[PDB]
């Protein structure tokens, strides 16, 4: 199973100094032996065999490099210890034990499965166990990907191996937003070519005058002229970032940054083949599973001439106070995404004592006219009938089945399944949205169910059968399309798209809202919408993965979607948007789709790609619900990944000396002092083994970071009760003082962190649109990542402090214009306000557009050059409205008289100054730049529904984004809505020019 | 006959109010309220439908909106009254004392509950460890049986020999390991069988968290639609 702790031991974290280990000879023997808990096994076995002579039969042993050790780990695996090197503490024993073995098996593949299971954090081996056809057949029919993504690596080697280690981090197109390119004098930018001459390795700069457009060949071309052949190539200072791919230099993310920030961008030449040798050629090979043999009257689902039967046996138990409780039923629904296909049933009503139905449920649906994604959603409910004639009903176990198997079998005969614990807040009698299966933990309570039989096998029809061909309005089909995603749909509007349906592909962005007037209930209108589909015009990536959503289930419909995002989806943007789609990868039916085959395909042919899927597959193998999903994925992805797998497993190890730590300080040394907690961290960071593991390997935040060696004197354990550790780590990368020397990252371990991860993502996508549409609102979208349960990485921003901190040591209102004032002397100090004024305005219109929770002195931080950002986020949307029930759209961030005389400079009244009013303006833009890319926002939401985010579980929590945005107005209203708004929250101030028209 | 006084008429709702009102209801169960003319929602099919009040196609016989409904009357209506049963009291300080308790008892069961869940989920969390720890136990004894099997395969011969020799001490010595190694095995058998006990303790405990919180969750929706019921009534009673 996976790991109970991070701890060396069971019911041991740390072992001590010195540990008796007992050691099992192939003759029988057994032999205790202090060891050191860092010591090797090489060192062990060499000490146990020289022990061994003192005890009978060690005439039966050979050398003792003829064995190897095995032992039982945490994991309940039997692991061979091939690697001799590994240290005692390292070895995730379950108990102090070694047994002696000679070496059998294929060497090569234990190897590589147990590097693979460390990764994964489960074992390999518990894949071959399980009995499920579909499980075993993914496991092998994914391997075409693993082979196509390899091949196409080692095409055009060593760049293509180059192209996928250090793919180009670019924007998605070349066209330069206008006042980016007003920062360009004569559109040319000034670059700094440094580069390490051989012997005393010297650094030599070279600052050159270059056209923006110029190609990264025409960049070396210039650095030569100031002293043809392409045997040269570029990377960023400081950092892993090459520039490979012939791309405008200010296409270039790092370059594009270097204009908007007015920095000097400094470049390091260095030489083709320098970088081209010390690449490994990555070698994938055919695993044991895929080698090894195995499965050791039909009828169409249209001439089935019966309406939809399930009969609902009995269960196990129920966990029910039955003084509390009256009586137990099970809820079913036969659902088509979240909709339902007909009217939910329920059985009788039974004793909580004895849950016993043996009901046959009928439902009003004609079994040809079931949809191939339809599925029987259920539930047992509790029913108290206390109070007048009021009745609650609370749900006590959930589970989903898809009605067709992956082989597109109709269900058939007796099923019993393992119900999921009700998620906290749902309080809807099903779970449509839950995954599909049974519980893999049995000690759940188990619903016996029974399916028809047909006196046969009964399988969807084949696509060729389904293909059976049995003026005012063009201006109202533009007005439907233009809607969002969550607008209301009208049965009128229904009927009006489903009537003009074939008009509708000469607007193909409609697909969505034409899809959801399809009557998924009737194989008539079904077969018509897959012909339509089939010959549909490709849309936008950003509208395509809406149809990856919980409410667009259809194989077909999914289909067309990933078709989208190979064709149009920019490596840039699948970077961007992956949390969404790893996280739609959870409504799909089946553990072999289209969307699992791109994602991979793309994971497994550029490695920046690869470390975030990597990432956020493995912080969820914690959840039963998704780990099988996850877990098959993941194991197809470190057999392809090549070498990115040994710095993987290094991140991995680093990562788990970081749990095991603040786990022991968490729990151990809970009622301990700062100062004794302090100088545990101190001699346990000291230890070799701890050294090794956290030293040298790439930053999981960022993998073109290198952490290198650890500044010991600069780790703490931070004051807040959660006990965070910050760690600083040098830059190991030879021109690390051109980019930052000290690589800060704060180690937490307690909060769930993906809500602050989402809320990052989506200030990130705001500031891009902000940018692109010529509007400098700079935000801090840092560095944020879950890495397991409740258990992440968070990047520091240097220089800067929370408003508290800058209050103190100094307190009045002007305390913080005084602040910036003193470290921004002289010429820089207008530059500081803009900056925070810039700054401060995205703030405030991102905050007040999510609901993130409310600002404080402590979760507001201001960088030394005035850059004002948030930190903490931690809730968003309506979070308040089931604990208070009060209807309102909240300002979390109310800029009091400190911020208001910071943008005013000093100033009297501050709402009637010019700076107030140029930072309304921004504040007013930045609204309608997100409104008008609403659907994008809505959509990034909708996708996430299936997380397990608390404040994010139905469409009716979306609907927040829906008010702040105001959807349902018009844009002049909506800006009317904003400004109303500001002026409640801040008692006045906030005006504008005209009203009738709303022009200048 | 009559407008605004008509039960199923419900105003400024919104569309997810209208959703929680037509949760899991009979199909024909229906209310009017405002757009964004106003909307008609219909339960059907599990769903619920929109259907827009311009007259739904035109040209009309609207006469006026109450004829519409009256006319399909679309059979059971989402009435204002009986809501309003809800709240008893006559004044608004009556009305605010009773908010004040409710918001109260409110706010304490919630803190129970939050609390229960992490109890809930920390038992989840403890007992899965400890099925890992006796599968961990189970694979460490059946290893230190085998040693047992592979010592007497052994052994078997050589203490038969020994004795041809007349030494006692390697015998003694031979049999002295076997002893380590089944006091070993019972002490391994022993620290399982106390894990075994924690584990259906540890899962007797889980059951009455479970059983527990099925109590609350009712009770805490209850009381929530009753504080969010007061509340209500005190926003329409007092000035706006
Ligand atoms: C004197 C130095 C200057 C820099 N610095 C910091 O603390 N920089 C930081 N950058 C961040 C921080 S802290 C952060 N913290 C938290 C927690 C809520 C977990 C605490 N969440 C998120 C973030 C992200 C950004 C020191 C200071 N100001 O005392």
């Known amino acids: 199973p996976p790991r109970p702790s991070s701890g060396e031991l069971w019911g041991i974290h740390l072992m001590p100094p010195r540990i008796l280990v007992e050691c099992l000879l192939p003759n029988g023997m057994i032999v205790t032996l202090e060891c050191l808990r860092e010591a090797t096994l090489i060192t062990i076995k060499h000490e146990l065999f020289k022990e061994a002579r003192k005890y009978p039969l060690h005439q039966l042993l050979q050398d003792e490099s003829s064995y190897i050790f095995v032992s039982v780990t945490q994991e309940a695996e039997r692991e061979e210890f091939f690697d001799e090197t590994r240290r005692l503490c390292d070895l995730r024993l379950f108990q102090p034990f070694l047994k002696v073995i000679e070496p059998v098996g294929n060497r090569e593949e234990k190897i590589l499965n147990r590097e693979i299971g460390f990764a994964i954090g489960m074992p390999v081996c518990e894949f071959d166990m399980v009995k499920d056809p579909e499980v075993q057949d993914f496991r092998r029919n ?248 009021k009745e609650e009903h609370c749900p006590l176990a959930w589970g989903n089945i898809n009605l067709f198997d992956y082989t597109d079998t109709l269900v058939s005969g007796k099923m019993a399944l393992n119900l999921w614990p009700v998620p906290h807040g749902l309080e809807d009698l099903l779970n449509p949205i839950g995954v599909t299966g049974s519980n893999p933990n049995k000690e759940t309570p188990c619903l016996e169910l029974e399916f028809d039989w047909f006196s046969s096998v009964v399988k969807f029809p084949d696509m060729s059968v389904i293909e059976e061909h049995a003026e005012n309005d063009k201006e109202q089909l533009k007005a439907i399309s233009t809607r969002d995603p969550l607008s209301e749909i009208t049965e009128q509007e229904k009927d009006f798209l489903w009537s003009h349906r074939h008009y509708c592909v000469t607007i193909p962005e409609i697909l969505p809202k034409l899809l ?30 809406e149809l990856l959503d919980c409410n667009y289930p259809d194989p077909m419909v999914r289909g067309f979607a990933v078709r989208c995002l190979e064709k149009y989806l920019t490596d840039d943007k699948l970077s961007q948007y992956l ?114 593991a956290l030293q040298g390997f790439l930053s999981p935040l960022n993998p073109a970071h290198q952490l290198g060696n650890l500044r010991l004197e600069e780790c703490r354990i931070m004051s807040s009760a959660k006990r965070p550790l910050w760690l600083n780590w040098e830059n190991p990368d030879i021109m690390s003082e051109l980019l930052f020397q000290n690589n800060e990252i704060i180690f937490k371990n307690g ?37 397991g349960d409740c258990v992440g990485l968070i990047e520091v921003v240097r220089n800067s402090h929370t408003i508290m901190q800058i209050q103190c040591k100094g307190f009045n209102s002007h305390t913080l214009h005084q602040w910036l004032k003193d470290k921004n002397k002289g010429e820089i100090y207008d530059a500081a306000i803009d900056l925070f004024t810039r700054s401060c305005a995205g703030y405030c219109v991102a905050t007040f557009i999510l609901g993130i929770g409310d600002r404080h002195n402590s979760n507001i931080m201001v960088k030394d050059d005035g850059q004002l950002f948030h930190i903490d986020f931690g809730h968003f949307l309506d979070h308040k409205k089931k604990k208070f029930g009060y209807k309102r759209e909240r300002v979390p961030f109310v800029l009091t008289q400190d911020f208001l005389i910071v943008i005013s400079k000093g100033a009297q009244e501050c709402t009637k100054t010019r700076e107030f009013e140029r930072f309304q303006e921004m504040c007013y833009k930045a609204y309608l730049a997100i409104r008008q890319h609403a659907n994008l926002f809505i959509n990034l939401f909708s996708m996430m529904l299936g997380s397990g985010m608390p404040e994010l579980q139905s469409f009716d929590d979306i609907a927040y984004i829906r008010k702040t945005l ?35 | 006959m009559s407008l605004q006084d008509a039960e199923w008429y419900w105003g400024d709702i919104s569309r997810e109010e209208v959703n929680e009102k037509l949760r899991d209801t009979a199909d024909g169960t229906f209310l009017v309220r405002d757009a964004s003319d106003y909307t008609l929602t219909l339960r059907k099919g599990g769903n619920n439908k929109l259907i827009k009040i311009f007259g739904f196609s035109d040209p009309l016989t609207f006469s006026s909106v109450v004829e519409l409904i009256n006319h399909y009357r679309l059979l059971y209506p989402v009435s204002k009254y009986q809501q309003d049963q809800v709240v008893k009291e006559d004044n608004i300080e009556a009305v605010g004392k009773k908010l004040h308790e409710y918001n109260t008892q409110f706010q304490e069961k919630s803190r129970e509950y939050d609390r229960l869940y992490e109890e809930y989920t920390r038992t989840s969390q403890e007992i899965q460890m400890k099925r890992t720890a006796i599968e961990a136990f189970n694979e460490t004894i059946k290893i230190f049986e085998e040693q047992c099997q592979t010592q007497e395969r052994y052994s078997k011969e050589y203490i038969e020999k020994f004795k041809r020799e007349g030494n006692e001490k390697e015998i003694q010595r031979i049999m002295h390991n076997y002893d380590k190694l089944k006091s070993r095995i019972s002490e391994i058998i022993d620290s399982r069988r106390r894990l075994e006990e924690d584990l259906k303790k540890q899962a007797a405990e889980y059951r009455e968290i479970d059983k527990r919180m099925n109590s609350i969750k009712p009770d805490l929706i209850q009381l929530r639609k009753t504080r969010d019921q007061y509340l209500m009534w005190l926003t329409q009673k007092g000035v706006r």
């Open chain 1, 966 to 1000: 105001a959807l349902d107005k018009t844009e002049q209203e909506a800006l009317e809505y904003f400004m109303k708004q500001m002026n409640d929250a801040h008692h006045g101030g906030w005006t504008t020019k005209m009203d009738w028209i709303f022009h200048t």
């Open chain 1, 579 to 692: 949390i969404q789609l790893v996280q739609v990868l959870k409504y799909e039916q089946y553990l072999d789709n289209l969307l699992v085959r791109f994602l991979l395909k793309k994971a497994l042919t550029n490695q920046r790609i690869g470390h975030f899927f990597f990432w956020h597959l493995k912080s969820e193998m914690h959840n039963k619900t998704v780990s099988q999903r996850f877990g098959l994925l993941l194991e197809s992805y470190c057999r392809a990944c090549g070498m990115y797998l040994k710095h993987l497993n290094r991140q991995v190890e680093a990562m788990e000396k970081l749990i095991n730590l603040t786990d022991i300080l968490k729990q151990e040394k809970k009622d301990e002092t700062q100062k004794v907690q302090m100088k545990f961290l101190v001699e346990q960071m000291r230890r070799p083994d701890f050294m090794d």
């Open chain 1, 142 to 389: 994914i391997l075409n990907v693993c082979k196509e993504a390899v091949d196409l690596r080692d095409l055009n080697s060593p760049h293509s191996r180059a192209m996928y280690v250090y793919p180009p981090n670019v924007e998605s197109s070349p066209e330069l937003p206008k006042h980016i390119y007003n920062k360009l004098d004569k559109g040319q930018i000034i670059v700094v070519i440094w580069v390490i001459v051989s012997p005393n390795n010297d650094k030599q700069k070279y600052t050159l005058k270059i056209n923006h457009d110029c190609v990264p060949e025409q960049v070396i071309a210039e650095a030569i002229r100031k002293k043809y052949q392409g045997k040269y190539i570029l990377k960023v200072c400081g950092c892993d970032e090459y520039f490979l791919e012939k791309y405008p230099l200010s296409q270039y993310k790092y370059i594009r940054s270097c204009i908007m920030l007015g920095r000097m961008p400094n470049l390091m030449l260095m030489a083709k083949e320098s970088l081209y040798s010390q690449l490994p050629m990555d070698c994938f090979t055919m695993p044991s599973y895929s080698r090894r043999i195995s499965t050791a009257s039909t009828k169409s689902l249209w001439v089935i001439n019966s309406a939809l039967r399930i009969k609902i046996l009995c269960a196990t138990y129920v966990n029910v106070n039955i003084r509390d409780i009256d009586k137990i039923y099970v809820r079913t629904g036969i659902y088509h995404g979240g909709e339902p296909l007909c009217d939910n049933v329920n059985t009788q009503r039974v004793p909580c004592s004895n849950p016993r139905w043996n009901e046959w449920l009928n439902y009003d649906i004609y079994i040809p006219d079931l949809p191939r994604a339809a599925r029987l959603c259920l539930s047992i409910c509790s029913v108290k009938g206390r109070k007048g004639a």
């Open chain 1, 751 to 787: 909060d769930d962190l993906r809500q602050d991860m989402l809320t990052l993502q989506i200030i990130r996508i705001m500031e891009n649109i902000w940018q692109n549409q010529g509007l400098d609102l700079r935000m801090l979208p840092y560095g944020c990542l879950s890495i």
């Open chain 1, 516 to 545: 959801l007037s399809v009557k998924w209930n009737s194989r008539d209108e079904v077969a018509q919408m897959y012909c339509l589909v089939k010959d549909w015009p490709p849309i936008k990536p950003e509208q395509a993965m």
